[PDB]
Design an enzyme around this catalytic site. Structure first.
Site, short mmCIF file in Angstrom:
data_model
loop_
_atom_site.label_atom_id
_atom_site.label_comp_id
_atom_site.label_asym_id
_atom_site.label_seq_id
_atom_site.Cartn_x
_atom_site.Cartn_y
_atom_site.Cartn_z
CB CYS A 193 44.59 23.39 -9.21
SG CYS A 193 45.47 22.44 -7.97
CE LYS A 219 46.17 32.32 -1.47
NZ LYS A 219 45.98 33.03 -2.77
C1 LIG Z 1 43.90 38.56 -5.07
C2 LIG Z 1 43.12 37.34 -5.35
C3 LIG Z 1 43.50 36.16 -4.73
C4 LIG Z 1 42.77 35.01 -4.95
N1 LIG Z 1 43.14 33.88 -4.33
C5 LIG Z 1 42.45 32.74 -4.51
C6 LIG Z 1 42.78 31.47 -3.84
O1 LIG Z 1 43.74 31.39 -3.05
N2 LIG Z 1 42.02 30.40 -4.09
C7 LIG Z 1 40.95 30.44 -4.89
O2 LIG Z 1 40.25 29.41 -5.06
N3 LIG Z 1 40.59 31.55 -5.54
C8 LIG Z 1 41.26 32.69 -5.40
N4 LIG Z 1 40.86 33.84 -6.07
C9 LIG Z 1 39.70 33.79 -6.94
C10 LIG Z 1 38.48 34.31 -6.23
O3 LIG Z 1 38.23 33.36 -5.21
C11 LIG Z 1 37.31 34.42 -7.20
O4 LIG Z 1 37.04 33.12 -7.68
C12 LIG Z 1 37.56 35.35 -8.40
O5 LIG Z 1 38.14 36.54 -7.88
C13 LIG Z 1 36.32 35.76 -9.21
O6 LIG Z 1 35.37 36.38 -8.33
P1 LIG Z 1 35.19 38.01 -8.28
O7 LIG Z 1 34.73 38.39 -9.61
O8 LIG Z 1 34.09 38.13 -7.31
O9 LIG Z 1 36.55 38.60 -7.94
C14 LIG Z 1 41.58 35.04 -5.84
C15 LIG Z 1 41.20 36.23 -6.48
C16 LIG Z 1 41.93 37.37 -6.26
C17 LIG Z 1 41.49 38.64 -6.98
C1 LIG Z 2 53.54 31.16 -12.82
O1 LIG Z 2 53.00 31.68 -11.56
C2 LIG Z 2 52.82 30.69 -10.63
O2 LIG Z 2 53.76 30.11 -10.08
C3 LIG Z 2 51.49 30.50 -10.22
C4 LIG Z 2 50.48 31.28 -10.79
C5 LIG Z 2 49.16 31.17 -10.39
C6 LIG Z 2 48.80 30.27 -9.40
C7 LIG Z 2 47.46 30.16 -9.03
C8 LIG Z 2 47.08 29.27 -8.04
C9 LIG Z 2 45.76 29.12 -7.62
C10 LIG Z 2 45.29 30.12 -6.47
C11 LIG Z 2 44.70 31.22 -7.16
C12 LIG Z 2 45.32 32.47 -7.40
C13 LIG Z 2 46.62 32.79 -6.95
O3 LIG Z 2 46.95 32.58 -5.74
O4 LIG Z 2 47.45 33.32 -7.77
N1 LIG Z 2 44.62 33.49 -8.10
C14 LIG Z 2 43.32 33.24 -8.62
O5 LIG Z 2 42.67 34.05 -9.28
N2 LIG Z 2 42.73 32.00 -8.35
C15 LIG Z 2 43.41 31.00 -7.63
O6 LIG Z 2 42.82 29.94 -7.42
C16 LIG Z 2 48.08 28.49 -7.46
C17 LIG Z 2 49.43 28.57 -7.84
C18 LIG Z 2 49.80 29.48 -8.83
C19 LIG Z 2 51.15 29.58 -9.22
#
Ligand SMILES: Cc1cc2nc3c(=O)[nH]c(=O)nc-3n(C[C@H](O)[C@H](O)[C@H](O)COP(=O)(O)O)c2cc1C
Ligand SMILES: COC(=O)c1ccc2cc(CCc3c(C(=O)O)[nH]c(=O)[nH]c3=O)ccc2c1
Ligand SMILES: Cc1cc2nc3c(=O)[nH]c(=O)nc-3n(C[C@H](O)[C@H](O)[C@H](O)COP(=O)(O)O)c2cc1C
Ligand SMILES: COC(=O)c1ccc2cc(CCc3c(C(=O)O)[nH]c(=O)[nH]c3=O)ccc2c1
Lengths: 313, 313
Positions: free
Chosen positions: A131, A44
């Protein structure tokens, strides 16, 4: 016949791994992903200090995909670093570590401490450029002077090969600009395209309500909605970054989807929403299905078709 | 129980119309839209001089949507102006005329000639801001100075109520910035969200080939792929622009999709890919489906639920 490959000086049983975010938060999650048939795993995205994330409900899935606004819940970098350092069985598969600190200084502090474990253990760094969402100004990856700063500061602080996770772009001039920034940096050996498609809104017709609680229902889109977008980004960077690997992410539900990513130029293929929905068993199916498509076509290697998508005339 | 609406000093039988570029190119097309049961129609986006557009193939459709790189094929301003002044039957329904000139100067020349017909016949202008500008720069609406420039010039040149067609945004900062710029211009009485999701890439697994010829297969996405994107943009602008109307456009295949767009804040609802795929009989289906949903829920008009999407807490 089998799908092993070698990259960034590591061996992989196949090009499949989880997407950062999905099944990689806890020690349980990480042990499970490790026990899977994935060629690799990513942790994560983490911050220095633990975070609880946004109020639930914050993730929802539908037949065509997913929406999320998790708010970067995670156990803190000290947890993932320790997993990287003392818990992970590198003889099973490589491990990638995602950091998504909320400032360049936050990320600089994390990478300095990650560097030695990278040296000693071989853990790999994925820098999440996608980000948070900066408050008066756009996310890092949509602000290219900011992106160039983070990459400067980080390459100085880490000094080893790493990679970056990109949000999707939607304009040719941004591909050209983004890709030119990335090629400024020789340590960035891989680009992961793409992160979720930012700020969609899913509304449920029966209750006439948004389906997630944070940000008035607005969230990142995954799954079948974004595949054509993920494929354009993979192939746009594939073409603009010839001395880098492209990892494709976005909308992989089958061996076919995976096959398309690779043809677009992907070396590794990441699974997000489908893995969340199906569970780790999906790796054995995607492998099988991809091996089946190769077999019907006469392909013995991924190298034979990687990036070889055909254009007309 | 009815779908009637009164806005911009016109009466509309229902909120449904074609999306610009779909079934609006020729006199044959326009007569067909007019003989349909659509609430209105909009003419293909025109340039000063007639254009052939890009080489075929240039549009393709699939279960979840479409890709296009048409390159602005159209009959030229003079044809659509003449349609507006002499051939259109305003007693059947209102006409929108869409202009998408390749420079600020080309837009200005056209609108100046449109003004008196707008006044005498009541034709309504939709400025397509998703136009390319000088190549190597983002499209006009992703470049807020160019957008500002184009709006002052057309506002001065036209002097009348018009509307604007926007591409999708994916970042809150852009929503805020694009809506702030729009709010500077009191003659912009309406905003259409959204145009195609830019530069996706569709790859066919059996042929290992892209499916459109221009731009190495890269094209604009419509349909089911883009519904959530489209609702996000509808609703962002509905909240950020209290003195303007929002028209919604994006992945409408059913009355429920129209219902959703309307709960997000849409006044009119346009149909693109679904209309291209199904033809104009789609409008009777959409209307019955929407009225069916309204009966079941107790709503007698559209304003009973327009903009009334609920959030959680
Ligand atoms: C529940 C959830 C949590 C995610 N958390 C992160 C994260 O911490 N960091 C990140 O780079 N991408 C995060 N993503 C984005 C995924 O890594 C991915 O880029 C995105 O889901 C699109 O791919 P998919 O169509 O295969 O779901 C998250 C996506 C989901 C659905
Ligand atoms: C306003 O809500 C927030 O505080 C907020 C929302 C989305 C965020 C999203 C990220 C990036 C991590 C991430 C998330 C996530 O952890 O929400 N979800 C994605 O689809 N891609 C991601 O890269 C980090 C901080 C965040 C803070
Ligand atoms: C073949 C085709 C031509 C289009 N031409 C135009 C155009 O000339 N001007 C414009 O503003 N939008 C154009 N669009 C975009 C549509 O107006 C619409 O915004 C987009 O397709 C999303 O609608 P949908 O999801 O219902 O397809 C075109 C779309 C298609 C598929
Ligand atoms: C492909 O390169 C070109 O020469 C070119 C020229 C003019 C263009 C003009 C547009 C804007 C008109 C338009 C088109 C279109 O005509 O291609 N397609 C859409 O989905 N939305 C639109 O708004 C889009 C792409 C273009 C490409």
């Amino acid at each position: 016949m089998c799908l092993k490959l070698n990259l960034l000086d590591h061996v992989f049983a196949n090009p499949f791994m989880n997407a950062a975010g999905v099944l990689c938060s806890t020690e349980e999650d990480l042990r499970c992903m490790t026990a899977s048939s994935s060629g690799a795993l990513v942790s994560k995205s983490c911050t220095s200090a633990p975070r609880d994330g946004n109020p639930e409900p914050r993730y929802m899935a539908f037949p065509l995909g997913s929406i999320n606004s998790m708010g970067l819940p995670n156990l803190g970098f000290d947890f993932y670093l320790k997993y990287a350092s003392d818990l992970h069985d590198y003889s099973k598969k490589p491990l990638f570590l995602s950091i998504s600190g909320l400032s360049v200084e936050e990320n600089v502090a994390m990478v300095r401490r990650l560097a030695p474990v990278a040296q000693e253990k071989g853990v790999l760094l994925e820098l999440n450029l996608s980000c948070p969402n900066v408050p008066g100004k756009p996310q890092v990856a949509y602000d290219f002077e900011a992106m160039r700063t983070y990459l400067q500061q980080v390459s100085l602080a880490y000094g080893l090969p790493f990679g970056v996770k990109m949000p999707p772009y939607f304009d040719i001039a941004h591909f050209d600009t983004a890709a030119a920034v990335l090629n400024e940096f020789p340590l960035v050996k891989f680009v992961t395209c793409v992160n979720s498609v930012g700020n969609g809104l899913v509304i449920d017709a029966e209750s006439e309500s948004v389906v997630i609680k944070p940000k008035q229902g607005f969230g990142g889109l995954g799954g079948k909605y974004i595949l054509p977008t993920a494929l354009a980004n993979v192939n746009a960077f594939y073409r603009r970054c010839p001395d880098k690997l492209v990892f494709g992410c976005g909308g992989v539900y089958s061996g076919e989807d995976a096959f398309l990513h690779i043809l677009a130029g992907a070396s590794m293929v990441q699974v997000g929403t489908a893995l969340q929905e199906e569970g780790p068993g999906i790796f054995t199916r995607l492998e099988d299905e991809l091996l089946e498509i190769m077999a019907r076509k006469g392909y013995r290697t991924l190298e034979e078709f990687r990036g070889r998508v055909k254009t007309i005339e």
